[PDB]
Design a protein around this ligand. Structure first.
Ligand code: PGT
Ligand code: PCF
Ligand code: PEF
Ligand code: PEF
Lengths: 57, 31, 42, 431
């Protein structure tokens, strides 16, 4: 299934470092966002986001 | 046909493997 | 047995491909490992 | 010079050359060291010695002719040289040798003498000849569990487990009419073209060669024969090559010729060549180079060999050679390609122009047993000139960049990094 389209992508070395670092940055950003979202939605009421509405009349 | 001291490489080659040897002299050796 | 009679290694040998199958897998994993190490270091 | 072809049950080939005056006619069989199981290894060598042993007196007594033989991987050849006017005698002797009858040639005393002579010869080869030993070990480690790795002379233990049944079985199973040609190199015009094909003057036992379950393989296995008694260290490297009848044969040959050979103890070899020679001359690392591009009917082997008195410098030599191979696939100047093309033209000219009828017969049979007719030297030169930098770069990228390699060595190999350091040096470098 590993066609020439995917085979060609495994030969660049001078430029691959920059794009791999950018991909690592994007992955860490999305991972941080996902973990923050899961920590948010695993606990409701205790957190300070909804106490504003709880005290609201 | 009327062999004598028939103990050749095939005799001890048979025990190790059988499918790898290409089925074209299996009939010869069994005969 | 002489040196030419190589001992059997079938216990760990895999499908008779010996091509980019293993190479691409290993390279992709180490690329991911570099990704994670770089992210942690940053 | 020209090539002729024809066939009726068998194949007959002839390359007339009136300049030479040493006519040689003999048969060639396309079944050698690659058509024998590991438990029956030296049967072909025993055949060669048993045809070179006893009737060599009869050939020189009854007539005049020198008979030779050669087994390389599958080309069991039995050439019978002679004078230009005495070819029919050679053909008649060959017929009385093979087709009828081989019973007299197969006796107890003659076979025992041949057996002990072959044992002594193989022991002497295994004792002294180191580079050939490492080459055979490279072959035996690159093709593990495949009918292409076992040596062409027979492992020591394999000789004494076969007497008359195995030899006759090999004769009845491989000496057939399907994989046999009758070369005619020398200065014979048309007698070979007519006398070879007759009503009954051809090899008996019509049939077919047994098929092989496994074709070939190549895995990156390492083999070491470390022993500190020897003074030097012989190591060889290899990669997967190409078989005969492929549109990469001459590109691979040119890639091998690019780096060429080298010999530090010759004043004419230290001042030519390409960069690694300059990088090596500064410190005395190596002595010999052999960039070989071997090809067989199943698979090939494009490699490298050396031998160093220095033992601490093995790692540097291997690293420099691998770095140069890496540089080959990215940046080669057109001058390098032109020089390699001229050198390869000269090399093939020497190989195919030698006045020996036996060598020409061997090459003719080798190239006719796979294709059907020999590829003439003019066409070879034309297609060599067809090669350019793009083709060699493409082939190098396809078959060298990050590919599985096989290693062998013997002698003082204490300073050789085992497998990962050598393999890593093909892609870890900045590209
Ligand atoms: C717990 C112990 C370690 C703690 C941390 C250690 C901190 C210090 C780290 C010191 C360097 C180690 C980091 C990884 C080094 C990778 C290996 C390396 O660079 O060395 C190779 C050196 O490789 C080369 O010479 C070629 C590659 C380099 C050329 C490309 C350079 C690209 C840019 C480099 C930027 C960094 C420059 C400084 C490098 C030190 C040796 O292998 P080889 O390719 O030579 O193979 C061996 C062969 O048989 C003999 O040569
Ligand atoms: C102030 C900076 C402090 C430091 C800033 C933060 C640095 C954090 C670094 C954390 C550790 C990262 C380790 C792995 C980095 C990496 O990508 O290495 C991989 C390559 C070797 O592998 P490759 O050759 O790219 O593999 C591909 C091979 N092909 C596809 C062609 C078959 O390796 C190389 O080619 C090595 C070349 C030299 C290093 C390049 C990396 C970037 C360096 C940037 C600065 C350069 C000066
Ligand atoms: C000497 C070089 C390292 C060798 C290995 C030793 C590893 C420990 C050395 C560092 C000491 C601990 C620091 C932890 C800081 C921290 O964990 O901070 C939390 C950060 C959050 O980043 P943020 O953006 O989400 O928030 C940023 C604002 N606070 O996440 C991480 O860091 C993930 C943990 C990575 C661990 C290192 C990765 C492996 C080594 C890579 C380099 C080799
Ligand atoms: C500091 C990091 C923590 C300590 C070291 C931990 C191990 C790191 C990898 C070592 C193995 C190795 O460097 O070489 C083995 C691997 C295997 O590559 P490969 O043979 O599979 O070929 C496939 C890839 N072509 O090559 C590499 O990664 C080469 C990396 C070279 C790094 C040089 C130093 C970079 C400095 C960056 C900052 C420069 C300023």
């Amino acid at each position: 299934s590993f066609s020439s389209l995917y085979k060609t992508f495994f030969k660049r070395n001078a430029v691959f470092v920059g794009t791999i670092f950018a991909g690592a940055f994007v992955f860490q950003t999305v991972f941080d966002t996902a973990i923050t979202s899961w920590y948010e939605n695993h606990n409701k009421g205790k957190l300070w986001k909804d106490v504003k509405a709880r005290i609201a009349a | 046909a009327q062999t004598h001291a028939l103990s050749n490489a095939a005799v001890m080659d048979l025990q190790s493997r059988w499918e790898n040897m290409p089925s074209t002299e299996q009939q010869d050796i069994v005969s | 047995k002489s040196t030419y009679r190589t001992p059997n290694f079938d216990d760990v040998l895999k499908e008779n491909n010996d091509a980019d199958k293993g190479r691409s897998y290993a390279y992709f994993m180490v690329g991911a490992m570099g990704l994670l190490s770089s992210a942690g270091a940053k | 010079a020209e090539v002729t072809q024809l066939s009726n049950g068998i194949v007959v080939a002839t390359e007339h050359n009136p300049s030479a005056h040493t006519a040689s006619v003999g048969v060639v069989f396309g079944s050698g060291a690659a058509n024998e199981n590991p438990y029956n290894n030296g049967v072909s060598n025993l055949w060669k010695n048993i045809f070179l042993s006893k009737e060599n007196s009869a050939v020189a007594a009854k007539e005049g002719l020198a008979l030779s033989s050669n087994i390389s991987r599958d080309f069991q050849s039995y050439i019978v040289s002679s004078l230009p006017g005495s070819t029919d005698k050679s053909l008649d002797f060959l017929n009385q040798s093979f087709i009828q009858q081989k019973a007299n040639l197969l006796s107890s005393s003659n076979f025992e003498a041949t057996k002990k002579s072959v044992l002594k010869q193989v022991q002497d080869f295994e004792e002294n000849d180191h580079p050939n030993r490492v080459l055979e070990h490279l072959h035996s480690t690159a093709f593990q569990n495949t009918p292409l790795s076992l040596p062409t002379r027979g492992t020591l233990e394999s000789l004494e487990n076969l007497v008359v049944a195995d030899l006759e079985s090999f004769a009845n199973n491989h000496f057939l009419n399907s994989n046999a040609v009758v070369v005619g190199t020398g200065n014979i015009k048309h007698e070979d073209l007519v006398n070879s094909i007759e009503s009954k003057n051809l090899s008996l036992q019509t049939g077919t060669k047994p098929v092989l379950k496994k074709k070939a393989a190549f895995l990156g296995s390492e083999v070491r024969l470390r022993d500190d008694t020897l003074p030097k260290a012989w190591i060889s490297l290899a990669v997967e090559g190409e078989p005969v009848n492929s549109p990469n044969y001459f590109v691979a040959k040119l890639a091998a010729q690019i780096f060429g050979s080298y010999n530090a103890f010759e004043p004419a070899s230290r001042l030519q060549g390409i960069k690694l020679l300059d990088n090596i001359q500064e410190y005395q690392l190596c002595d010999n180079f052999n960039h070989f591009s071997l090809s067989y009917k199943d698979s090939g082997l494009w490699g490298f060999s050396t031998a160093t008195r220095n033992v601490t410098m093995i790692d540097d030599l291997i690293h420099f050679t691998l770095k140069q191979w890496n540089r080959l696939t990215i940046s080669v100047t057109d001058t390098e390609v032109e020089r390699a093309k001229s050198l390869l033209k000269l090399q093939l000219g020497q190989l195919y122009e030698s006045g020996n009828p036996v060598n020409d017969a061997n090459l003719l049979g080798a190239e006719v047993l796979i294709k059907g007719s020999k590829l003439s030297l003019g066409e070879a030169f034309k297609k060599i000139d067809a090669i350019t930098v793009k083709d060699v770069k493409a082939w190098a990228g396809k078959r060298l960049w990050d590919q599985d390699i096989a290693i062998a060595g013997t002698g003082q190999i204490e300073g050789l990094l085992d497998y990962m350091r050598i393999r890593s040096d093909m892609s870890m470098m900045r590209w």
